[PDB]
């Protein structure tokens, strides 16, 4: 998980709680996921 801060990180984590694919949770909140373990610099939080 790579969000721009606690705001998104909290949202994407609140949208996948029910049954949403992090994609729809990081697309609506902005955060973004990546097939690895190194987040970007704008979403390194």
Q: What gap in Å lies between CA 24 and CA 39, rounded to an integer?
A: 18
Q: Are 12 and 3 in contact (CB under 8 A)?
A: yes
State which approach was used to obtain the coordinates. Answer: NMR
CA dist., res. 14 & res. 12, Å (int): 5
Residue partners of 39: CB distance under 8 A and separation at least 6: 1, 2, 45
User: Check: CATH 3.30.1350.10 for 1-45?
Assistant: yes
Q: How many CA atoms lie within 13 A of 39 on its CB side?
A: 14
CA distances from 31 to 3, 14, 22, 38, 42 (A): 4, 12, 9, 14, 10
C-beta of residue 39 within 8 angstroms of C-beta of residue 4 = no
- Cα–Cα nearest to 30, from 5, 17, 21: 5
Rounded distance between C-alpha atoms, residue 24 and residue 45, angstroms: 18
């Amino acid at each position: 998980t790579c969000c721009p801060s606690i705001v998104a990180r909290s949202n994407f984590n609140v949208c996948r709680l029910p049954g949403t694919p992090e994609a729809l949770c990081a697309t609506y909140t902005g955060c973004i996921i990546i097939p690895g373990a190194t987040c970007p610099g704008d979403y390194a939080n």
